[PDB]
Write a protein that binds this ligand. Structure first.
Ligand SMILES: COC(=O)NC1(C(=O)N[C@H]2CCCCC/C=C\[C@@H]3C[C@@]3(C(=O)NS(=O)(=O)C3(C)CC3)NC(=O)[C@@H]3C[C@@H](Oc4nc5c(nc4C)CC=C(OC)C5)CN3C2=O)CCCC1
Ligand SMILES: [Zn+2]
Length: 198
């Protein structure tokens, strides 16, 4: 009934991947109880830092990456949800189900990656566990892992970046190709497809 109808909560930043120094490591900035409360209110007063955020809904967790002032993630994680912010829920600025892509204005305090113009095919995928995984680019939206590993190790890293040797954004991780549970290849939204959308 219309009186009964519920509202989905916001996406919430619950941590980050720290790439500041010589060692990449994940940091949690909010626990599950505070995450649930912030998803319901959409009001997140925590300080945001860095380029790759770990984000959560009530039911899923994944990554979001700032590139050129937009916090980008996957539609299959975020759907059409708002993101929590200090002043309340923020509506998506970009939504493209056909690319599995959404974006919001990048949160104050975040740092944005620069879009890659190198044309390099030697990429690096950053996971929610702060693994930096070498990936050879194999097409506009595909790359192969140099060291395959079970898909378990990639689960929850959609929305994370593929970076070039110079640390620029080449794309947003979207999906994995699984052969008997082993990830041999990944698919990603290329940064040019974000640059078009903008
Ligand atoms: C043979 O057929 C295929 O396998 N084809 C493909 C393939 O589907 N692979 C699978 C293998 C899964 C097994 C686990 C893979 C591990 C990590 C994955 C990175 C990662 C991830 O981590 N998610 S997550 O953070 O955990 C989560 C779910 C919390 C957000 N994403 C995934 O699971 C995604 C989700 C889904 O894909 C899509 N859903 C949608 C859209 N577009 C895609 C492409 C567009 C519009 C939508 O509206 C709803 C939905 C299946 N996904 C795969 O990756 C592979 C080649 C191209 C597509
Ligand atoms: Zn580059």
């Amino acid at each position: 009934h219309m009186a009964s109808m519920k509202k989905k909560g916001s996406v919430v930043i619950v941590g980050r991947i720290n790439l500041s120094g010589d060692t990449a490591y994940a940091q949690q900035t909010r626990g599950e109880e505070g995450c649930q409360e912030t998803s319901q209110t959409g009001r997140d007063k925590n300080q945001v830092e860095g380029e790759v955020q770990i984000v959560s809904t009530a039911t899923q967790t994944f990554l979001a990456t700032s590139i050129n002032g937009v916090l980008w993630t996957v539609y299959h994680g975020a759907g059409t949800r708002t993101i929590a912010s200090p002043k309340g829920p923020v509506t998506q600025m970009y939504t493209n189900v056909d690319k599995d892509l959404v974006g919001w204005q990048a949160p104050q305090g975040s740092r944005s990656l620069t879009p890659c113009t190198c044309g390099s095919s030697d990429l690096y995928l950053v996971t929610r566990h702060a693994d930096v995984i070498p990936v050879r680019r194999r097409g506009d939206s595909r790359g192969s892992l140099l060291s395959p590993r079970p898909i378990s190790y990639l689960k929850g890293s959609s929305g994370g970046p593929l970076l070039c040797p110079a640390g620029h954004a080449v794309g947003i991780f979207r999906a994995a190709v699984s052969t008997r549970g082993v990830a041999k290849a990944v698919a990603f939204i290329p940064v040019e497809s974000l640059e078009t959308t903008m």
